[PDB]
Amino acid sequence: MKNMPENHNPQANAWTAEFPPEMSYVVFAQIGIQSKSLDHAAEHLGMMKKSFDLRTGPKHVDRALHQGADGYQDSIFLAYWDEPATFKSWVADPEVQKWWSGKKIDENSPIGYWSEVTTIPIDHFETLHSGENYDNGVSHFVPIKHTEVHEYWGAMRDRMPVSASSDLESPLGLQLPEPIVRESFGKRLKVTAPDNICLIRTAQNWSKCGSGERETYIGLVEPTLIKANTFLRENASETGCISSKLVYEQTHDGEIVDKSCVIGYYLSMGHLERWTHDHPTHKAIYGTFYEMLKRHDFKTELALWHEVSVLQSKDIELIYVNCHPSTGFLPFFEVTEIQ
Numbered sequence: 001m002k003n004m005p006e007n008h009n010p011q012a013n014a015w016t017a018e019f020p021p022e023m024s025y026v027v028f029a030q031i032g033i034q035s036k037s038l039d040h041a042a043e044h045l046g047m048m049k050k051s052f053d054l055r056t057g058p059k060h061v062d063r064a065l066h067q068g069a070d071g072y073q074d075s076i077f078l079a080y081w082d083e084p085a086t087f088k089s090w091v092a093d094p095e096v097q098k099w100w101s102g103k104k105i106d107e108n109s110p111i112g113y114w115s116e117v118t119t120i121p122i123d124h125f126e127t128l129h130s131g132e133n134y135d136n137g138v139s140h141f142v143p144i145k146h147t148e149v150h151e152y153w154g155a156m157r158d159r160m161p162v163s164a165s166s167d168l169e170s171p172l173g174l175q176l177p178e179p180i181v182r183e184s185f186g187k188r189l190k191v192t193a194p195d196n197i198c199l200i201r202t203a204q205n206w207s208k209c210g211s212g213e214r215e216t217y218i219g220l221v222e223p224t225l226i227k228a229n230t231f232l233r234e235n236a237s238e239t240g241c242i243s244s245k246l247v248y249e250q251t252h253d254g255e256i257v258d259k260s261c262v263i264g265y266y267l268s269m270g271h272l273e274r275w276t277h278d279h280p281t282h283k284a285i286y287g288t289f290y291e292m293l294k295r296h297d298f299k300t301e302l303a304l305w306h307e308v309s310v311l312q313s314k315d316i317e318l319i320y321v322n323c324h325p326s327t328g329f330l331p332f333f334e335v336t337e338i339q
């Protein structure tokens with residue numbers, strides 16, 4: 001609450017996850033099939049989707065489609081557990097072992113496999129929701145409550161309990177190295193990340209918007225989001241953004257719905273903060289959002305939310321099997337070949 005302004009009174013309501021006392025960790029797993037034609041991914045996606053309904057399966061799973069550059073796509077599962085023990089039991093199930101860690105991927109395969117598994121201690125985790133919505137990531141299975149801790153720069157950091165006792169800076173300092181090009185196709189590679197990287201899933205949901213509000217979101221706001229994500233992807237060193245994906249969410253048979261999110265990793269929470277507060281790209285987003293609020297009497301059916309975590313090296317398992325060299329963390333930090 002260090003950054004809360006004096007006489008703080010927010011002009012809009014917001015909600016935040018309230019984790020139960022017995023809950024110590026969230027496991028958030030991003031599992032992806034990389035392809036040039038979705039046809040080639042279809043077999044792998046069926047096997048994975050049947051795995052999620054095991055009794056040890058995730059409390060919640062989203063599906064999303066990422067358009068990468070060079071014409072590669074990632075078909076992604078976003079899966080949540082509230083017990084690390086249960087997630088370990090899921091991975092050990094033989095149904096999961098049939099495909100886990102890219103086991104079904106060939107040396108000359110047309111598809112790649114990747115997984116980014118982050119085990120998030122609850123005191124390094126915070127969410128924010130623009131409405132009392134129980135279909136926003138962990139709000140599918142965790143209660144949410146009203147909070148006044150928003151609507152100022154620094155509110156995100158204040159909502160994360162550990163920021164009261166840690167600056168959450170990176171051991172590598174302020175300068176993320178330039179991305180390097182590694183020979184990743186044909187190989188099973190593991191990346192080891194530094195401590196205190198910051199992960200954000202920030203989401204947009206215009207599915208309940210009226211016709212006119214939807215027109216405004218798609219015509220005015222979404223283009224600035226697309227531009228922001230492209231900037232982030234192309235300017236890693238300047239921003240401290242290790243990886244940024246704009247993805248469109250899907251029904252579980254693959255139909256794209258009116259929902260998206262950006263999933264980004266940053267060298268520290270401070271890099272995310274400085275980009276959000278100072279860079280023109282997020283300012284244009286905030287501007288067009290406010291313009292959208294003025295047009296509809298400041299009462300929107302657009303749902304916004306995010307989940308932000310700060311991660312230790314040992315809590316991030318990053319695996320890339322036959323993937324494009326720009327996928328995820330592949331351009332950064334320490335890589336090890338697995339065999």
Ligand code: HEM
Pocket residue numbers: 014149150151152153154155156157200202204221225228229262264272273276282285286289304
């Ligand atoms: C690349 C995509 C995005 C990133 C990385 C991002 C990042 C962030 C972060 C980190 C904050 C919290 C800053 C703090 O509390 O100190 C924030 C706040 C905010 N963002 Fe974004 N954002 C993105 C997209 C969007 C979109 C699409 C919208 C609206 C359509 C939006 C509107 C806002 C608003 C209104 C706030 C203030 C929230 C509050 O505290 O009440 N952002 N953003």
Ligand SMILES: C[C@@H](/C=N\O)c1cccc(Br)c1
Pocket residue numbers: 013014015128129130131150202203304305306
């Ligand atoms: C989730 C965040 C945006 N980006 O992380 C946001 C945006 C608008 C209103 C609220 Br309330 C929260």
